[PDB]
Design a protein around this ligand. Sequence first.
Ligand SMILES: Cc1ncc(Cn2c(C)c(CCOP(=O)(O)OP(=O)(O)O)sc2=O)c(N)n1
Ligand SMILES: Cc1ncc(Cn2c(C)c(CCOP(=O)(O)OP(=O)(O)O)sc2=O)c(N)n1
Ligand SMILES: Cc1ncc(Cn2c(C)c(CCOP(=O)(O)OP(=O)(O)O)sc2=O)c(N)n1
Ligand SMILES: [Ca+2]
Ligand SMILES: [Ca+2]
Ligand SMILES: [Ca+2]
Ligand SMILES: [Ca+2]
Ligand SMILES: [Ca+2]
Ligand SMILES: [Ca+2]
Ligand code: NA
Lengths: 525, 525, 525
Amino acid sequence: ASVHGTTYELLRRQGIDTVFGNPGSNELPFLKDFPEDFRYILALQEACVVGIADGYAQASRKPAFINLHSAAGTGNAMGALSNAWNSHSPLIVTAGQQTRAMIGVEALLTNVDAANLPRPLVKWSYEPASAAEVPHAMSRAIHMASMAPQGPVYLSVPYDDWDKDADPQSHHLFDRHVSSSVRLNDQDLDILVKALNSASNPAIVLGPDVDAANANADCVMLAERLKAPVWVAPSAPRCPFPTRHPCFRGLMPAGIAAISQLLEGHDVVLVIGAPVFRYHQYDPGQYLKPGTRLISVTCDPLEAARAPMGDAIVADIGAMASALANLVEESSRQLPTAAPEPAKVDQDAGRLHPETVFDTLNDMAPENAIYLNESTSTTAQMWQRLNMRNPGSYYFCAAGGNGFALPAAIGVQLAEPERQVIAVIGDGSANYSISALWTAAQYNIPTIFVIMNNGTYGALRWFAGVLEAENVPGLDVPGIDFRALAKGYGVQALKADNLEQLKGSLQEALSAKGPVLIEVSTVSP
Amino acid sequence: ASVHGTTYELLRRQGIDTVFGNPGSNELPFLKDFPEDFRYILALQEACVVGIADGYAQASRKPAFINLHSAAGTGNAMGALSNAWNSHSPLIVTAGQQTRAMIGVEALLTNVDAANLPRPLVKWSYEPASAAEVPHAMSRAIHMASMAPQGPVYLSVPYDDWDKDADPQSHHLFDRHVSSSVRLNDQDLDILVKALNSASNPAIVLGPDVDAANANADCVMLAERLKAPVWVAPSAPRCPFPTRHPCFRGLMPAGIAAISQLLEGHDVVLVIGAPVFRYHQYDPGQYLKPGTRLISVTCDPLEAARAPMGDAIVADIGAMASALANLVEESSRQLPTAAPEPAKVDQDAGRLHPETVFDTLNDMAPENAIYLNESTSTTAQMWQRLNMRNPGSYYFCAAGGNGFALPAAIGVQLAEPERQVIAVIGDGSANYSISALWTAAQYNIPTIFVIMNNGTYGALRWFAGVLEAENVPGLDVPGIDFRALAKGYGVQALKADNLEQLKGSLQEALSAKGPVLIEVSTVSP
Amino acid sequence: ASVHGTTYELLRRQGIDTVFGNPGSNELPFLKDFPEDFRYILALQEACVVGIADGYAQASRKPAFINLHSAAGTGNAMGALSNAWNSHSPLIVTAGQQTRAMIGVEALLTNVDAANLPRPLVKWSYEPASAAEVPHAMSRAIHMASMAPQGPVYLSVPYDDWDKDADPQSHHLFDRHVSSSVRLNDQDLDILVKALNSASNPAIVLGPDVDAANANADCVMLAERLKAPVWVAPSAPRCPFPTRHPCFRGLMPAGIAAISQLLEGHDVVLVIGAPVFRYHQYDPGQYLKPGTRLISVTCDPLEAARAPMGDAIVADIGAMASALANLVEESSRQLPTAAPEPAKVDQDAGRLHPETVFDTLNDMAPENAIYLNESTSTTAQMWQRLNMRNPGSYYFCAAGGNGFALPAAIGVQLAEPERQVIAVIGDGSANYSISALWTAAQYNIPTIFVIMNNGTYGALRWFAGVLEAENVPGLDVPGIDFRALAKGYGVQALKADNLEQLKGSLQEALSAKGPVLIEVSTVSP
Ligand SMILES: Cc1ncc(Cn2c(C)c(CCOP(=O)(O)OP(=O)(O)O)sc2=O)c(N)n1
Ligand SMILES: Cc1ncc(Cn2c(C)c(CCOP(=O)(O)OP(=O)(O)O)sc2=O)c(N)n1
Ligand SMILES: Cc1ncc(Cn2c(C)c(CCOP(=O)(O)OP(=O)(O)O)sc2=O)c(N)n1
Ligand SMILES: [Ca+2]
Ligand SMILES: [Ca+2]
Ligand SMILES: [Ca+2]
Ligand SMILES: [Ca+2]
Ligand SMILES: [Ca+2]
Ligand SMILES: [Ca+2]
Ligand code: NA
């Protein structure tokens, strides 16, 4: 067998059947004779390729396979890898290298010092020392991406390797099963459970790895047993809990003092599947108030090490959530009371308030819709106004890097063909990965893109106000016609200048058979 | 003085007056109170920011200053840095970091292990250990980018540093002058000159660092004195010689055997300002034939070390070209005969052959036009058909990374307001950095963009044919309306489906007062 | 509180009370006002410092704290870190940096790009962005070294940081408890247990992480229940099993084909706490024979990913060994039969055969002796001839790097004051870290050093024979007087030229009150 044949066999035996890519010359020997059981998803720029793959991996809860071109293609994807690192996304990033005989001379298209290029945003990064090693290196990449804590990995392959003979012993790779589905030992788990059972006023904080593990339902059982309020950890990349459940208390503010004040009076705070914590604004004060102690369950040693307070347990979130939910006592305390609905903001017949947009989406969207957020000044309102009952219903750029949601929404829609994806993206953010629209058109992936057009980088105006910074350039983005961009890439487009038009546009989009972009004129901040 | 005030003073004292950027939260404390004598050029995605800055630096022959956001913004620019590394572009890349007090916790927007992120594509990469060090670190960045061999550098700055007090001793930085304008010692230079004077059939090969040094005219004098044919080294990022001068012989083929065959019979081959050599296709054979010896003058130790043959001298290209041109004897040999004009290809009333497009551009464009090339299957024809008399007249992605020419053409046009820039970009390549169009519209930078639309990644079909690779996915890019994309970003747009319309479109574009995009229907390969 | 006071409080609250070091100027602000409850162990060269700390950490099963000087001191320790990486040794390596105000100028003693220096041999490597972050960075280092898979970490601290004010919120660091004591979920653990219970001819292979976890006794119970033979994985850094237990089968040969042949006929091979596998010689063939399947339990994702065959589970070795030992059925198969004693080799009245030395050690040493091995040509005989009943009884350089055993034996003896340590070290290996002898003398740490003096690098002669390599220089090390070296560093020294003198020398050494070196004249290979 060739390295080509052996590697595609390994991939299919490990459950991989899709290549997200933008091709180049070093990759043609890999892509040729493309197997009939695989499918290739082209995107026009590598941030788009990786964003699509990332949404697909996060929603499908399985690794996604990517093929990029050498250093320039890898480099174009590096901002997307920033986000994937902070979402623990299992991404297998492969890139083609020059033929081994010209790597030394640094021929055009040589990826120099290739393994160092995507560092520090990958868990593992490698270029094999010979062609026959390629399948074994691919096996390493698959497992490194997939083991807890999941994350992106990188493999560079000289183009001449694919046609070489494989090692006959590579067959031992095909059916390897690697598990990290582990939980705390019984003795120590009993100590934790007793601490939770004994707490007088526990609180629960959940992060993205809960949703990645599909631990959401177990966390609902845990919160119901403990009679405990539940928040989402700050800067949330995913939604780990039903947002209208009576225990839900919303998105935590991303500040040190704000969080310790919120937790004041809670004796035990159990954090599951989050860093402790993804603060943003500097809001100095106490990490925790006297009387509060914190216990974190995390799948990532790096998160456990860097928490500034609390105890930690490094284990699989699915296994731990299941065990805790099933072991804790039912407390005799009263179940928390559901938060009241948000108020309707006043809305005239002109430009839309973001609150109106989210209320209207909540009214019109299916109950199993999936939302993505890159409308960066409106996140708090989004979290208050969308009832997200089901797992896998929300994604936000985990590193804060714009350019995620537009492509990721396409990947999510590919992963979840029966759940309508609705990406709510600001006019600023829409540009970073605009060409991803083309992939939705070409493959008829029926994502709805809602562009919140207020003419400015609103979240930067917000932060400038926090800093009391004046005379800052570069904050306005006038003069973009998003319907023309959508037409450019073959996507049906609508505009909503007022509420009547927003309702009409959403009704048309929801009954369309392909992707649709709606440009919404929103109020300037 | 604050670090902010001191750093802008250093920048202006070192000749920097423009910030190319896409802002974020960590950068607002740098950008605030933006000085009145500076200008800020916004682009909508970081590949665009860096491409614009790169074109500006290459055309202006001076460093360009960039400001990006943390890891995600830096990462989005990494493919652009691939190209800048191989063009020796003097780019000062700055990125904002989180406040020092939350770097440890890895708050949102922390750039983890920041200096390793852009490696291996930068000459120098650093995050200062204290606020007061920032001006001194900026000084290092300026000089590292600017000294031979020029190239990109990276500086990460915690956002809280800018308001801190500067070191009063930072004033010693402001007027430092650093020179690398050096040439081989007299004794050894005399030996080289005697070898050139003695040669029976010398040849000259020129690379991009000739054009970067503005050594072009000196190289013309040298070639005229030596009566020697002149080629351009393969995979050429710039044009180092007048393309209708009698000595000019065109772009070398990017293959080992092809080059040694071309040089056969030349006893001494003098390479100036090029790697030896940027081959692409694998074309194995002799590096040089018996009877040919090679001497390379390069500004880059890495190029001198990796050449597989020849002697080398590491020195400034401007200083060496001037010295050689003025020291060599005038040979009594006959001056080489100019190459004949290319033939007109047959052209019917339908889709355009690329050769027709280039002939028409050559007929209609001003004599001091500047061209950029990202029409990757048509490079050889472009080189044959455009008379480029002047320095600074051609740019092509030096690492082969698509996404350079569209933004770079804007930067070049900014650098050269009196020379009409015409970027010839394939339909595939146009997408990588499409949002750069917006910057041309907003700042009214009157670049002309000629989109060669053949529906496919033609150069990849070419390489697949070289490999005899079949059943490759992802090679076609149907369904893009470039006039709608241009309208999306505010750029006037025209379409040319035939030669009559191409002439009309070019006449309109050349008399327009702002940027113009022309979508040209070209023949499918 | 100062950073100094806060950091020593963190250290003592996390169980650290000893600093292994070689001081320098950048470290004096850390070491000053040294707390009375700590002790400082000086060694004369940094390979020695780290080797001592490594033996201490491995034997004490807890992290060891090291302080080295800047880049040169860190660099001198890098070979020792090679070994520590492959033994999963929890080492907290700190090094002093220049004052922040001169880092930029690169004053003498600046550690440039410090965090990259010990890479790739550390799990985590960092220099804090401010003085107030130092305690939090130290907390990260402690936990990163200590969490599974344990390993070395690196922290660089500018010397001016220690006297700065600490953050009052650093107290939350002091009592953090971080656990990685995890095991496979119940459902999947039951599947594994059923597979073991069902096996017709199981085999067990154990590696060093068993001994690190003190899982040895659980592995004895497991082997007795399963009625299974037990080997030690190749290139063994530790001894995980009693070597005279009836199930024990010895050290595996370090070759692919040799291992698959050894395992032939075993239907299920359970590997615990080892890489799969640390082969040495290239012995190509089948990784496993038909009929054998492999299951690995490893604490290290990197080991699970790179195994070329088998299933894997990533979990804590102590927790998994305990669970398996207690859950499996007692098989009705007959218990394996103990291996017979090794034969006595013929020995005349002259130079000693290594087999004689090991037999004599086994006869004379206490039953709870601890051995170290850096007599590299005699490892197989050592493993056959020493009855090691107890955990923590054997150490060998895990990366194969000479210079470990001499210092490590001192650290082990410090960790285990009531168990006599006997380091068996070749004449070649003894030189790498010879100055470590001084630390044994100064602190009266009563290690016995047995120098096997055959005049040559015997293991290299062995490998040269495997390669059929001739005319190799540098293999002989004549002319070293080890008694004079021992006298140089204050250690009592004896010589044994024959068996009578070996017995007499060992009797004297075993009844000495301090360290003793015995130079043994062994047969030349
Ligand atoms: C890759 C990248 N570049 C720049 C930024 C900075 N950035 C920018 C540019 C934001 C503004 C986005 O504007 P929008 O129109 O999408 O939404 P709002 O107007 O609601 O903020 S939010 C933010 O953090 C970033 N985080 N990531
Ligand atoms: C960043 C990046 N991604 C992908 C490629 C691979 N690539 C691609 C995708 C080419 C085709 C460009 O198509 P075009 O329409 O711009 O021009 P032609 O049809 O004339 O080739 S040429 C080439 O090397 C690359 N070099 N750089
Ligand atoms: C730091 C280091 N340097 C060199 C070696 C090479 N080396 C050397 C030099 C060996 C010979 C050791 O000789 P010895 O006298 O200690 O024992 P033997 O004569 O029994 O081999 S074994 C071995 O791998 C190494 N592994 N590590
Ligand atoms: Ca098919
Ligand atoms: Ca906006
Ligand atoms: Ca002005
Ligand atoms: Ca094309
Ligand atoms: Ca004391
Ligand atoms: Ca020896
Ligand atoms: Na990098």
